[PDB]
Amino acid sequence: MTTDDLAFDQRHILHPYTSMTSPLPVYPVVSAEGCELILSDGRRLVDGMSSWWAAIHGYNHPQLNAAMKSQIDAMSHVMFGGITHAPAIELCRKLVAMTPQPLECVFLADSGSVAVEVAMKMALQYWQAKGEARQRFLTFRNGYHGDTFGAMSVCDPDNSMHSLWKGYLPENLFAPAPQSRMDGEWDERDMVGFARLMAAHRHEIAAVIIEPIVQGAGGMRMYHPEWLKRIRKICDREGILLIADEIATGFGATGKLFACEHAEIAPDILCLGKALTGGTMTLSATLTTREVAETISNGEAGCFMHGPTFMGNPLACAAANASLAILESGDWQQQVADIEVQLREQLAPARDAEMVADVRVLGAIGVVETTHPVNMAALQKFFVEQGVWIRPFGKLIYLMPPYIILPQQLQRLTAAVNRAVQDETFFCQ
Amino acid sequence: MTTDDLAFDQRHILHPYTSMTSPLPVYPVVSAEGCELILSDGRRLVDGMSSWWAAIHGYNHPQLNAAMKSQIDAMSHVMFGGITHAPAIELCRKLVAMTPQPLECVFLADSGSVAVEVAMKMALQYWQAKGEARQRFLTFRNGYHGDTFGAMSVCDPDNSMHSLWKGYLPENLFAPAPQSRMDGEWDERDMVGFARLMAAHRHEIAAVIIEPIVQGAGGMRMYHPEWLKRIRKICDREGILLIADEIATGFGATGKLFACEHAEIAPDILCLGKALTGGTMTLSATLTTREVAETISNGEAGCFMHGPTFMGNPLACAAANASLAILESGDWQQQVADIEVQLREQLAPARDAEMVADVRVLGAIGVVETTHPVNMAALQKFFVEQGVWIRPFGKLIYLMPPYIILPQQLQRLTAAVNRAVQDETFFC
Numbered sequence: 007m008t009t010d011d012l013a014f015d016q017r018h019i020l021h022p023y024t025s026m027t028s029p030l031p032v033y034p035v036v037s038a039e040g041c042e043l044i045l046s047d048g049r050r051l052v053d054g055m056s057s058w059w060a061a062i063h064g065y066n067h068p069q070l071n072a073a074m075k076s077q078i079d080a081m082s083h084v085m086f087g088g089i090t091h092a093p094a095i096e097l098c099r100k101l102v103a104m105t106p107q108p109l110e111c112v113f114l115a116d117s118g119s120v121a122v123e124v125a126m127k128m129a130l131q132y133w134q135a136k137g138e139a140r141q142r143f144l145t146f147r148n149g150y151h152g153d154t155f156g157a158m159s160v161c162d163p164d165n166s167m168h169s170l171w172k173g174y175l176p177e178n179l180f181a182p183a184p185q186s187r188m189d190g191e192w193d194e195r196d197m198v199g200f201a202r203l204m205a206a207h208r209h210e211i212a213a214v215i216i217e218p219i220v221q222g223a224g225g226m227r228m229y230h231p232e233w234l235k236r237i238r239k240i241c242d243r244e245g246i247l248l249i250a251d252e253i254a255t256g257f258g259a260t261g262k263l264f265a266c267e268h269a270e271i272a273p274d275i276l277c278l279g280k281a282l283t284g285g286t287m288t289l290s291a292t293l294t295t296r297e298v299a300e301t302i303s304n305g306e307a308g309c310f311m312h313g314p315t316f317m318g319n320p321l322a323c324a325a326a327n328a329s330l331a332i333l334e335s336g337d338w339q340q341q342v343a344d345i346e347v348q349l350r351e352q353l354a355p356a357r358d359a360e361m362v363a364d365v366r367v368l369g370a371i372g373v374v375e376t377t378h379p380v381n382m383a384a385l386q387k388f389f390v391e392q393g394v395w396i397r398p399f400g401k402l403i404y405l406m407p408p409y410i411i412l413p414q415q416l417q418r419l420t421a422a423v424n425r426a427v428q429d430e431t432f433f434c435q
Numbered sequence: 436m437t438t439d440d441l442a443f444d445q446r447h448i449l450h451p452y453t454s455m456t457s458p459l460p461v462y463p464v465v466s467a468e469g470c471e472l473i474l475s476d477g478r479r480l481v482d483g484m485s486s487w488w489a490a491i492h493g494y495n496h497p498q499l500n501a502a503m504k505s506q507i508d509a510m511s512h513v514m515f516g517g518i519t520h521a522p523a524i525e526l527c528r529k530l531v532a533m534t535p536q537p538l539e540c541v542f543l544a545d546s547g548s549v550a551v552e553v554a555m556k557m558a559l560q561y562w563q564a565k566g567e568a569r570q571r572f573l574t575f576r577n578g579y580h581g582d583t584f585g586a587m588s589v590c591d592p593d594n595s596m597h598s599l600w601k602g603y604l605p606e607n608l609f610a611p612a613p614q615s616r617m618d619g620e621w622d623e624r625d626m627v628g629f630a631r632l633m634a635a636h637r638h639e640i641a642a643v644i645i646e647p648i649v650q651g652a653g654g655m656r657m658y659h660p661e662w663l664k665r666i667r668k669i670c671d672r673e674g675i676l677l678i679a680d681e682i683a684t685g686f687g688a689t690g691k692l693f694a695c696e697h698a699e700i701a702p703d704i705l706c707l708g709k710a711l712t713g714g715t716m717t718l719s720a721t722l723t724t725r726e727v728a729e730t731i732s733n734g735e736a737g738c739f740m741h742g743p744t745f746m747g748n749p750l751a752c753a754a755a756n757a758s759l760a761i762l763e764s765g766d767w768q769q770q771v772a773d774i775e776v777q778l779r780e781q782l783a784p785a786r787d788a789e790m791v792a793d794v795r796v797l798g799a800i801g802v803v804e805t806t807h808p809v810n811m812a813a814l815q816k817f818f819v820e821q822g823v824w825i826r827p828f829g830k831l832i833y834l835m836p837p838y839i840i841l842p843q844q845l846q847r848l849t850a851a852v853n854r855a856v857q858d859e860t861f862f863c
């Protein structure tokens with residue numbers, strides 16, 4: 007990669023949620039192996055974010071690689087209309103077996119946002135088919151479900167800037183963010199808001215959608231599992247669908263295979279993505295129950311009306327079959343337990359820093375929330391110089407490393423965090 | 436693959452737009468090479484639809500393979516937030532260069548639908564930054580743009596069954612479907628609808644969005660390029676953005692590199708996907724102008740508010756690069772030219788079949804439109820028994836084969852189509 011390649015990138019290539027007139031610096035990666043990213047100039051970085059961009063088994067994993075390569079020898083892609091293949095069946099068998107019993111019908115898709123769109127369509131088609139006038143979604147504030155329009159309509163209105171689309175996006179019901187912590191105690195006062203809303207709109211709610219236990223992009227919030235239990239029972243009593251969005255929390259991230267395990271409840275609809283392919287390439291899945299899947303197909307449309315071009319992509323399905331196989335061993339449970347301990351123990355000191363507002367850890371996720379917003383360019387440069395790759399945002403410095411990370415690499419990550427929040431050098435902007 | 440796998444699929448695996456309570460057989464494939472699909476049982480089928488599912492250089496193409504495997508050895512994926520890489524830069528270079536000049540800013544994404552969502556978002560944020568109250572889209576009937584909510588909002592309301600969501604989807608403006616054919620003459624009566632709508636809502640319209648020349652999933656319609664000429668001008672006069680959705684037409688499919696080339700116009704926003712990666716795996720791109728990209732970045736938000744987890748995926752960008760490099764040889768122009776001729780020539784006779792209403796052809800797209808709907812299960816089986824894979828829908832039997840297809844393979848495809856519409860056996 008030349009400097010001219012870099013100039014081209016800056017002037018012509020958009021990047022996630024970042025300015026094209028006032029763009030901050032980017033770092034050129036030429037390859038990756040194990041737990042490290044390798045930049046163009048040869049520097050190696052221990053990646054602390056890997057799992058959040060789905061790389062729970064690190065990079066250049068031999069099994070993942072062999073699987074992808076082999077499937078390429080057989081067939082990278084083939085359409086899924088009127089056709090089926092070994093990789094999609096192996097994957098759906100795994101998805102069905104590993105998730106709660108009632109989740110037995112799978113709709114494969116390309117991305118997480120689409121997976122949420124699908125869930126949202128399912129709920130609406132479901133009630134259309136049963137002749138009920140239900141088009142509203144009840145969610146929590148601080149939730150995040152993707153960037154496409156329907157997904158956006160259940161994202162927190164303040165965090166996602168709904169004033170930008172005011173009059174374009176449908177208006178859903180937003181109950182207050184869960185206050186009870188995962189670490190702590192349950193306070194029944196938390197329920198009043200959700201409850202008030204349920205009463206006023208019980209007859210028009212199509213589904214309760216939430217990220218279980220961890221609210222990711224909307225604040226790395228970690229709340230009490232009793233919440234899920236209450237929501238399931240309320241949905242049970244009122245006859246409402248519950249969508250659980252586990253695109254971020256699935257496949258071991260919170261210490262359990264699925265965050266809903268923390269409460270021993272099953273949603274009617276489950277969204278999955280990210281770690282699903284072990285972070286090799288995009289793929290997603292929306293699981294639902296026989297009752298929903300069948301009901302939808304018995305209505306006016308004769309089917310569930312959705313179906314992406316690359317649906318069921320064999321290359322991506324193989325990658326995921328290999329990713330789930332690594333999890334089959336069960337080694338991750340302990341890998342994460344140990345990562346969980348090391349994060350609590352090694353992030354604790356941040357509770358002593360002037361710039362810190364709170365610290366919280368759950369599974370492979372460690373968050374250090376700061377009092378003031380970070381300076382993106384300056385803090386990013388700092389981390390790179392420590393030989394680590396950590397990507398903050400807003401008032402959040404968080405880690406979610408590969409489950410395979412050696413204690414020596416995780417220690418380097420935590421020290422870099424602890425060092426970044428000691429004074430105000432890297433804060434504000 | 437065993438029969439229990441097949442039983443599992445039926446019972447647990449949803450497929451595109453199809454019932455879970457009354458699914459139709461699905462055929463199990465174990466591999467593919469050149470232009471053939473290889474069923475579990477050993478039967479080989481010539482694929483006639485490969486290019487519509489993005490596979491314009493066929494299957495198991497050596498150049499695409501090597502590139503993908505090489506990239507895998509470097510890295511399959513790495514996040515794009517604060518990071519860049521060669522596959523992403525080579526791709527965006529090629530995309531900027533091969534599209535009209537004003538299109539020089541690339542938002543890479545995962546899938547076509549999302550690419551359309553990106554465009555629509557781009558348009559709304561643009562006007563928002565300018566302080567104008569413009570939230571409606573003007574499109575055309577029989578248009579199809581994806582299955583996500585926003586994309587659905589600009590799809591033909593009849594074709595996509597909007598009543599299901601009546602009250603949830605925003606109500607946009609639908610000009611009538613274009614009547615003038617790509618084969619035929621221009622008729623100016625075609626404009627009145629559009630003009631009446633523009634006159635009444637010019638002040639609230641954020642953008643015009645359409646599929647150029649060919650309207651795919653909404654009817655495989657082939658209309659006159661003057662339409663694009665006219666729309667580009669009105670939008671220019673009124674200050675309105677034009678979005679061109681070339682997810683299905685891009686990369687040589689209509690005989691030009693991009694169907695816009697047929698009318699000699701450039702849109703403000705361009706959506707690409709499907710053949711972008713030579714049909715190996717999913718990827719998408721949305722290009723726009725500097726005026727649009729910058730204006731968005733200077734508004735309230737300070738940037739364009741979007742960013743998928745797998746944005747910029749190196750593996751898919753590698754594939755795409757290897758696919759565009761094949762197109763660089765120019766060989767596709769002659770390949771598609773010939774396929775266009777062979778298709779016109781060999782489907783012509785279907786015009787005389789009683790089950791047929793219209794035969795139209797453009798580039799590597801050949802369509803036989805029938806008078807009644809096809810018998811899905813029965814026709815699919817017929818095709819498979821002829822050793823070909825043809826996937827019809829509604830009243831449409833179409834082919835869109837890989838550009839590398841041999842005249843003999845193509846002829847087997849055209850022979851099957853003409854045979855299929857020869858009586859009502861396979862209809863209703």
Ligand SMILES: Cc1ncc(COP(=O)(O)O)c(C=O)c1O
Pocket residue numbers: 313314315316546547548549551579580581582646651652680681682683684708
């Ligand atoms: C014109 C057009 N736009 C958008 C799409 C959406 O593509 P996908 O279903 O991959 O999201 C398609 C799919 O074929 C298409 O043909």
Ligand SMILES: Cc1ncc(COP(=O)(O)O)c(C=O)c1O
Pocket residue numbers: 117118119120122150151152153217222223251252253254255279742743744745
């Ligand atoms: C809970 C949750 N849902 C949905 C998404 C959307 O995933 P994608 O950005 O791939 O569309 C994310 C992305 O991080 C997420 O964390």
Ligand code: NA
Pocket residue numbers: 101102103104105106107108109110
């Ligand atoms: Na299950």
Ligand code: NA
Pocket residue numbers: 530531532533534535536537538539
């Ligand atoms: Na260009």
